[PDB]
Structure formats: C-alpha cells, structure tokens
Amino acid sequence: IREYEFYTNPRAKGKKTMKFNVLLTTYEYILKDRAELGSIKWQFMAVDE
DNA sequence: GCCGCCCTGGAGAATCCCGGTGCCGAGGCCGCTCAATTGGTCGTAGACAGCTCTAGCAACCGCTTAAACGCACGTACGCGCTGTCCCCCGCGTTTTAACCGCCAAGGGGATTACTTCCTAGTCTCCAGGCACGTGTCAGATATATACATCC
C-alpha cells in the first residue's frame, strides 16, 4: 500500500505528491506506523469512537 | 638265706581368696578479682499520625504475530559386545629416613606495668559541590532550486 498506491510518482526522489484522497486505518497501525504516517500533510482527521 | 622289683599311704609346697594400705583422676572448698549487676539520669531512635503521589493488582477487553506445539522422517549417536595389550596392583626384598630423644646459645614474641603525645572524635560555622532545571548554540539531516545532459 505504501509503495504502490500512496504516491503518484513513487519512482522519484524529491517531494512525492499524494495519489489517494481518504485513508482508512485503525489505532494499531497508527501506533505501529507513526513514522510512515506523520510526515504527511493531512487536511482532515476523523477519529471514530 | 640273701637280694631285687611292684603297689600304696601321709606330709611338704604351689595357688586362690580376702583384708589392710598406698597411689591416680576427679570433685568440693577456698581465695583472688574483674566483669556482670543494680540504680539513677538523660538524650534520642523509633513508633505513631498525617498528607501527597506513584506503583501494583484482580479481572476483563481487543489486536497482532511470533513462538510453541504436533507430527513425520531420517540418520547420527549412545550403547552394548568383543578383542587386545598395557599398565597398575600385589608381593617379596632392601634401603632409608621419619620419629623420638638429645645438646647449645640466642632471638621473637606474648604478657604486665608504665609514660607520653599525637591524632582522631566532637562541636560550631560557613561555603561550595552536587543535584536539578533551563536558555542557547553548533553539528547533523532533509529538501528547494538552478545547471549540464540523453533521447
């Protein structure tokens, strides 16, 4: 998911634009992947429960 | 008639038992004597109470995922048997030194008593080192943007 679908141009080395619009995740992968998700300029967060 | 040989009885000496007396191990008694006891005083160690903050605990949840478990196979190793040879054990003989009993004098060290003085405990006062918290600063890291180039 991270290398095939996050980036429109994952083959580049500079700034990578986002390809998706909404990302669904759970709490376990929020804590497991803090480093791979914190460096994303999010526009909106919706936390259920 | 005279001389030599076999059978049997009572008195002299050795041994067991008992009593009187002297010597070794241990306990009661006495004397010194120093350390435990008793009595009193006082300071403080610790018990108790109180408040605050953090860790643990019982019993439940949910998710992930790597470790545990079960099973099949295979093969390596534990184990048993046999041979062999060699080295340790048993014994007889000879040596030798440990052990015990001896000088010969001298120093080391354990006590007993005494003297002295240096150094460490104790007390008071003070200050700086250690513990904690924070502002700031230079090295490391990531990316923004401009230039040369291949297809």
Side-chain angles (χ1 to χ4, degrees), chain A residues 13 15 26 28-29 32:
Chain A
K13 268 82 181 173
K15 175 62 70 178
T26 65
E28 291 89 44
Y29 304 110
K32 266 195 165 198

Coordinates of all heavy atoms in Angstrom, one line a residue, chain A residues 13 15 26 28-29 32, chain B residues 62-65 143-144:
Chain A
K13 N 12.7 10.9 -6.2 CA 13.4 11.0 -5.0 C 13.2 12.3 -4.2 O 13.6 12.3 -3.0 CB 14.9 10.9 -5.3 CG 15.5 9.5 -5.2 CD 15.2 8.7 -6.5 CE 15.7 7.3 -6.4 NZ 15.3 6.4 -7.6
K15 N 10.2 15.6 -3.6 CA 8.8 15.7 -3.0 C 7.9 14.8 -3.8 O 7.7 14.8 -5.0 CB 8.3 17.1 -3.0 CG 6.9 17.3 -2.5 CD 6.8 16.8 -1.1 CE 7.5 17.8 -0.1 NZ 7.3 17.4 1.3
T26 N -6.7 1.9 11.5 CA -7.1 1.6 12.8 C -6.0 2.1 13.8 O -5.0 2.6 13.4 CB -7.3 0.1 13.1 OG1 -6.1 -0.6 12.9 CG2 -8.3 -0.5 12.1
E28 N -4.1 0.5 15.9 CA -3.0 -0.4 16.0 C -1.9 0.0 14.9 O -0.7 0.0 15.2 CB -3.3 -1.8 15.8 CG -4.1 -2.4 17.0 CD -5.6 -2.2 16.8 OE1 -6.1 -2.4 15.7 OE2 -6.3 -1.8 17.8
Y29 N -2.4 0.4 13.7 CA -1.4 0.8 12.7 C -1.2 2.3 12.8 O -0.3 2.8 12.1 CB -2.0 0.4 11.3 CG -2.2 -1.1 11.3 CD1 -3.5 -1.6 11.2 CD2 -1.2 -1.9 11.3 CE1 -3.7 -2.9 11.2 CE2 -1.4 -3.3 11.2 CZ -2.7 -3.8 11.2 OH -2.9 -5.1 11.1
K32 N 1.7 1.7 15.2 CA 2.7 0.9 14.6 C 3.4 1.7 13.5 O 4.6 1.5 13.3 CB 2.1 -0.4 13.9 CG 2.2 -1.6 14.8 CD 1.9 -2.9 14.0 CE 2.3 -4.1 14.8 NZ 2.5 -5.3 13.9
Chain B
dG62 P -13.1 -8.4 22.8 OP1 -14.3 -9.2 22.5 OP2 -11.8 -8.9 22.8 O5' -13.1 -7.2 21.6 C5' -12.6 -5.9 21.9 C4' -11.3 -5.7 21.3 O4' -10.2 -5.8 22.3 C3' -10.9 -6.7 20.2 O3' -10.8 -6.0 18.9 C2' -9.5 -7.2 20.6 C1' -9.1 -6.2 21.7 N9 -8.2 -6.9 22.7 C8 -8.6 -7.8 23.6 N7 -7.6 -8.2 24.4 C5 -6.5 -7.5 24.0 C6 -5.2 -7.4 24.5 O6 -4.8 -8.1 25.4 N1 -4.4 -6.5 23.8 C2 -4.9 -5.7 22.8 N2 -3.9 -4.9 22.2 N3 -6.1 -5.8 22.3 C4 -6.9 -6.6 22.9
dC63 P -10.6 -6.8 17.6 OP1 -11.2 -6.0 16.5 OP2 -10.9 -8.2 17.8 O5' -9.0 -6.7 17.3 C5' -8.4 -5.4 17.4 C4' -6.9 -5.5 17.1 O4' -6.2 -5.9 18.4 C3' -6.5 -6.5 16.1 O3' -5.6 -5.9 15.1 C2' -5.8 -7.7 16.8 C1' -5.3 -7.0 18.1 N1 -5.2 -7.9 19.3 C2 -4.0 -7.9 20.0 O2 -3.0 -7.3 19.6 N3 -4.0 -8.7 21.1 C4 -5.0 -9.4 21.5 N4 -4.9 -10.2 22.5 C5 -6.3 -9.3 20.7 C6 -6.3 -8.6 19.7
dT64 P -5.2 -6.7 13.8 OP1 -5.1 -5.6 12.7 OP2 -6.0 -7.9 13.6 O5' -3.7 -7.1 14.1 C5' -2.8 -6.2 14.6 C4' -1.5 -6.9 15.0 O4' -1.6 -7.6 16.3 C3' -0.9 -7.9 14.0 O3' 0.5 -7.7 13.9 C2' -1.2 -9.2 14.7 C1' -1.0 -8.9 16.1 N1 -1.8 -9.8 17.1 C2 -1.1 -10.1 18.3 O2 0.0 -9.8 18.5 N3 -1.9 -10.9 19.1 C4 -3.2 -11.3 18.9 O4 -3.8 -12.0 19.7 C5 -3.8 -10.9 17.7 C7 -5.2 -11.3 17.4 C6 -3.1 -10.1 16.8
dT65 P 1.2 -8.1 12.5 OP1 1.6 -6.8 11.9 OP2 0.4 -9.1 11.8 O5' 2.5 -8.8 13.1 C5' 2.9 -8.7 14.5 C4' 3.3 -10.1 15.0 O4' 2.3 -10.7 15.7 C3' 3.7 -11.1 13.9 O3' 4.9 -11.8 14.2 C2' 2.5 -12.0 13.9 C1' 2.2 -12.1 15.3 N1 0.9 -12.6 15.7 C2 0.6 -13.1 16.9 O2 1.5 -13.1 17.8 N3 -0.6 -13.6 17.1 C4 -1.6 -13.7 16.2 O4 -2.7 -14.1 16.5 C5 -1.3 -13.1 14.9 C7 -2.4 -13.1 13.8 C6 -0.1 -12.6 14.7
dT143 P 13.2 14.8 2.5 OP1 11.8 14.4 2.6 OP2 14.2 13.9 1.8 O5' 13.2 16.2 1.7 C5' 12.3 17.2 2.2 C4' 12.7 18.6 1.6 O4' 14.2 18.8 1.9 C3' 12.6 18.8 0.1 O3' 12.0 20.1 -0.1 C2' 14.0 18.7 -0.4 C1' 14.7 19.4 0.7 N1 16.2 19.2 0.7 C2 17.0 20.3 0.6 O2 16.6 21.4 0.6 N3 18.4 20.0 0.7 C4 19.0 18.7 0.7 O4 20.2 18.6 0.7 C5 18.0 17.6 0.8 C7 18.6 16.2 0.9 C6 16.7 17.9 0.8
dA144 P 11.2 20.4 -1.5 OP1 9.8 19.8 -1.3 OP2 12.0 20.0 -2.7 O5' 11.1 22.0 -1.5 C5' 12.1 22.7 -0.8 C4' 12.4 24.1 -1.5 O4' 13.8 24.2 -1.6 C3' 11.9 24.1 -3.0 O3' 11.8 25.5 -3.3 C2' 13.1 23.5 -3.7 C1' 14.3 23.9 -2.9 N9 15.2 22.8 -2.7 C8 14.9 21.4 -2.5 N7 16.0 20.7 -2.4 C5 17.0 21.5 -2.6 C6 18.4 21.3 -2.6 N6 19.0 20.1 -2.4 N1 19.2 22.4 -2.8 C2 18.7 23.6 -3.0 N3 17.4 23.9 -3.0 C4 16.6 22.8 -2.8

